[PDB]
Amino acid sequence: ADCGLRPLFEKKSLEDKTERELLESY
Amino acid sequence: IVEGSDAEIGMSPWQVMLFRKSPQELLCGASLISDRWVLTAAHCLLYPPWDKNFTENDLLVRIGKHSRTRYERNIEKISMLEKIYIHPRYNWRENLDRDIALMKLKKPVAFSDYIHPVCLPDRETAASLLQAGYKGRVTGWGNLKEGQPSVLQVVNLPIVERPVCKDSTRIRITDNMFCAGYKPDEGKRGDACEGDSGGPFVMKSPFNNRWYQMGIVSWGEGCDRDGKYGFYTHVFRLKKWIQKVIDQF
Amino acid sequence: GDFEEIP
Ligand SMILES: *[B]([O])([O])[C]([C][C][C][C]C([N])=[N])[N]C(=O)[C]1[C][C][C]N1C(=O)[C]([C]C1=[C][C]=[C][C]=[C]1)[N]C([C])=O
């Protein structure tokens, strides 16, 4: 539904300190 | 979690703590998939070889936690369990094949900044993402070395090729599992450890920016041992069983 | 245990 969208991150367009790491492996 | 770091506030809104009443102590990790459903590993509730067999009266679920031991006053929500469903073909006799269970909360919880469900993967998502080289993320309050942190820990780990997985253990590996971690020649390290079981291995879809739960911490021989890998339940593969129970109940 | 009592 609104799953996998974190209130303090995605919804605010804020990236966590290491998510770039994941994305760069894809 | 070994060689991890402190999670940021609201980093894993779906992380859940399996907690027992008497003695009060941390059973395992888990994840919020909906307002009424929690996903964990079956071996957290049932494991005869060790005389482990928890009933709903035995546990409590703590959602929206950051601090391990602290009763986070206006932040966390504690729930009682209505009923527990273990996969009927969970193989505790041999290799923990189909290590998954669904928990039904007595009442739905309300979402907040700290509490939010993770997405269950679809066929195409699983297909794009579950690829050797791809990093996922594991979180937990488990042991720091093969002692305990004060705060939820996090580590990102690469999906390892099936063959490598098979060659690292004496244990019979199945299609309902996948292994993750770094290889001895990568220089980086990390792994889940005791206390981490039932926790989530998640990936962020580069297609829709959403977080999907790919695995569940299942088993591994020690923690962060060189040439060894952590094993996880392949969620997508058990999706039909999941869909099944939810619609059913 | 290491744990803070729950209401
Ligand atoms: B869980 O309960 O916290 C635990 C830890 C998972 C983290 C391991 C890792 N990634 N390094 N899992 C277990 O304790 C399971 C449950 C029963 C035995 N078990 C194991 O992991 C065993 C090996 C085993 C695998 C499959 C079937 C039977 C046994 N590992 C050890 C070290 O005893």
Is domain A1-26 in CATH 3.40.250.10, yes or no? no
Please say whether the beta carbons of B54 and B66 come within 8 A.
no
CA B240/CA B195 separation, integer angstroms: 27
Active site residue B67: no
Count H helices and E strands in chain A, helices first: 1, 0
Resolution, given in Å to one decimal, reads 2.2
Are B218 and B139 in a shared domain?
A: yes
Are B34 and B123 in a shared domain?
A: no
Please say whether the beta carbons of A6 and B116 come within 8 A.
yes
Number of Cβ pairs < 8 A linking chain A and chain B: 68
Are B32 and B136 in a shared domain?
A: no
Q: What is the dihedral of CA B219, B222, B224, B229, to 10 degrees?
A: -40
Active site residue B116: no
Are B47 and B146 in a shared domain?
A: no
CATH of residue B195: 2.40.10.10
Residues of B in contact with A19 (CB under 8 A): 204
- Which DSSP state fits B222? S
Are B90 and B107 in a shared domain?
A: yes
Are B112 and B155 in a shared domain?
A: no
Are B125 and B5 in a shared domain?
A: yes
Q: Angle B222-A25-B192 (CA atoms, 0-180°, nearest 5)?
A: 20
The upper half-sphere exposure of residue B215, i.e. CA atoms within 13 Å in the direction of its Cβ, equals 30
Are B43 and B160 in a shared domain?
A: no
Q: Do chains C and A touch (3 or more CB pairs under 8 A)?
A: no
Nearest CA in chain B to A14: B11
The upper half-sphere exposure of residue B31, i.e. CA atoms within 13 Å in the direction of its Cβ, equals 30
Are B158 and B222 in a shared domain?
A: yes
Experimental method: X-ray
CA of B217 from ligand 1 middle (Å) equals: 9
Are B156 and B129 in a shared domain?
A: yes
Residue-number span of the structural domain to which B199 is assigned: 1-12+118-236
Are B158 and B216 in a shared domain?
A: yes
φ, ψ for residue B131, nearest 5 deg: -130, 130
* Overall domain count for chain B: 2
Largest CA distance in chain A: 26
Q: Which of B152, B147, B177, B21 is nearest to B75 (CA)?
A: B152
Are B78 and B123 in a shared domain?
A: no
Domain boundaries, chain A: 1-26
- Rounded to the nearest angstrom, the minimum Cα separation between B10 and chain A is 6
